[PDB]
Amino acid sequence: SDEINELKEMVKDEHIYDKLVRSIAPAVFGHEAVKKGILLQMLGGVHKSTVEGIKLRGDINICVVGDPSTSKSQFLKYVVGFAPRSVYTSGKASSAAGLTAAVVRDEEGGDYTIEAGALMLADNGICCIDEFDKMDISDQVAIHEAMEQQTISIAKAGIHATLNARTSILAAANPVGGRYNRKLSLRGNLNMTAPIMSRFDLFFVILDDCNEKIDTELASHIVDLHMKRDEAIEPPFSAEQLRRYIKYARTFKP
Amino acid sequence: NLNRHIRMNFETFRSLPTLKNSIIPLVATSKNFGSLCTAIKSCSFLDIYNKNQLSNNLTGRLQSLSDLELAILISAARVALRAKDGSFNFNLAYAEYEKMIKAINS
Ligand SMILES: Nc1ncnc2c1ncn2[C@@H]1O[C@H](COP(=O)(O)OP(=O)(O)OP(O)(O)=S)[C@@H](O)[C@H]1O
Fold it and tell me: The domain containing residue A188 runs over which residues?
């Protein structure tokens, strides 16, 4: 009954949805668009199956794509340290086989078996990724089934199996030319095929442009960070009570 | 002040008849001696004169435009920027203007 009071507070307050969203990236400056996109990530859908016919996905896959110095890797190397059971992979260093599932031999029975991989051991948690563009298609392919069909299926070395990977994913690839010509359009500017461009049920092409009433604030912010003493960064909700509040809210299936 | 205005004319124009055209009104406009003495001591009328001479070369025009004109202008300039030769049709200006408005609403 005690902790019920704590939730009762953090849920009966009026502006929680705002109090939350501006309190997901205490270090990062602003980006109230993306921070929203993340807060919704950790709070999945319902994944409730249809009539016995088929089952449909119930998870969200935000996929940032930003110009240089947009603090897009900070969101990841934060989430993967705050979202439960998560994993951070640079992608281009990794391979597609490693990402979905591995087949390997064991001496116990002299038989082939499964290596969980990032996707299967990332079940019911966000599996963030970096630099899609750098990941050659040979590994971009191995994800699709963990996007919409929600489950991986593998037929190798005699073993046929299928493992369900209910895993939110993410991304942080950079545009084609590192930074992307405002001149050019967006079509011939992302360098990624149609499907994997669609399966991402968010999209955030983050820009980076000049200003004064912005860049001054940003610089003051970064400085205050590097001025440890000026860690006034305390947001309303700590990075802990947010966890318990989620672990509650994960259960409503409206 | 008058010294400063003379120096300005010298550095930029370096031409007496220009300054003469500036003086003619300032003198001839006054009605009483005290007013003229005040003027030549302050030479404030030279300010308005410079301004009006300058009024609508290219900046005043830009300033005397309403919203929608400014929008068409900005969007057309962006279209010119995209293409290399700067040559932009009217249709391109309109399409870019439309998507800009779509963004503003968005
Ligand atoms: N909006 C911001 N506010 C404060 N600091 C920022 C911001 N954006 C970037 N930084 C800082 O600048 C550094 C670069 O950030 P990022 O651009 O996210 O690096 P990154 O994730 O490697 O980007 P790429 O695309 O992978 S090269 C980070 O270490 C941040 O601390």
Answer: 1-254
